[PDB]
Every structure is written in structure tokens, then in C-alpha cells.
From a paper:
M-phase phosphoprotein 8 (MPP8) was initially identified to be a component of the RanBPM-containing large protein complex, and has recently been shown to bind to methylated H3K9 both in vivo and in vitro. MPP8 binding to methylated H3K9 is suggested to recruit the H3K9 methyltransferases GLP and ESET, and DNA methyltransferase 3A to the promoter of the E-cadherin gene, mediating the E-cadherin gene silencing and promote tumor cell motility and invasion. MPP8 contains a chromodomain in its N-terminus, which is used to bind the methylated H3K9. Here, we reported the crystal structures of human MPP8 (hMPP8) chromodomain both in free form and in complex with the trimethylated histone H3 lysine 9 (H3K9me3) peptide (residue 1–15).
To unveil the molecular architecture of the chromodomain of hMPP8, hMPP8 chromodomain (55–116 residues) was recombinantly expressed and crystallized. In the free form, the hMPP8 chromodomain consists of a twisted anti-parallel β-sheet formed by three β-strands (named β2–β4), and α helix (named αA) located at the C-terminal end packing against one edge of the β-sheet next to β2. In the asymmetric unit of the crystal, two hMPP8 chromodomain monomers form a dimer through the interaction between the β2 strand from each monomer. The β2 strand from one subunit runs anti-parallel to the β2' strand from the neighboring one, pulling the three-stranded anti-parallel β-sheets of two hMPP8 chromodomain proteins adjacent to constitute a six-stranded anti-parallel β-sheet. Specifically, Asp66, Met67, Thr69, Gly71 and Gly72 of β2 strand form hydrogen bond with Gly72', Gly71', Thr69', Met67' and Asp66' of β2' strand from the opposite subunit, respectively. The dimer interface has a buried surface area of about 1025 Å2, which is strong enough to form a stable dimer. Sequence alignment result indicates that hMPP8 chromodomain is more similar to HP1 choromodomain and lacks the residues in dPlycomb chromodomain for dimerization. It was quite unexpectedly to find that hMPP8 chromodomain forms homodimer in our crystal structures. To determine the oligomerization state of hMPP8 chromodomain in solution, size exclusion experiment was performed. The size of hMPP8 chromodomain in solution is corresponding to dimer, consistent with the observation in crystal structure. Therefore, the chromodomain exists as a homodimer in solution and the homodimer structure in crystal is not due to crystal packing.
Residue numbers in the entry: 0 to 60
The structure:
Amino acid sequence: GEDVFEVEKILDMKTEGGKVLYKVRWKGYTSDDDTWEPEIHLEDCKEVLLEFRKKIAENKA
């Protein structure tokens, strides 16, 4: 009941009136299934966050 779905990775982020959302790729699903999630859903996904921060840093320089 606890692991029905898994985040593969954060694809991108946004704010909407200052509040953070993440666009999520669900492991085992296609890009048609991607969703926007509020930050509080991902805030504790440490590895997922590290990987997204790395992708930000890499696209910076």
C-alpha cells in the first residue's frame, strides 16, 4: 500500500505566487504521466533533491 508509485526524478520546478512545485517523472511511467507536485510531497526525498540540484548546477556552468 506504501510504495504503489515511485518518483524517478524531478524534471523541473516552478513557483506560483512564491510557492514551490516540482514536475515529476514517475518510475515505470511515460512522460504522458508526468505531474506537478507541491514541494511538501518531495521535501524529504533527499536523493531525488540532490540529483535535481546537480542538474541545476550542470545547466548553469
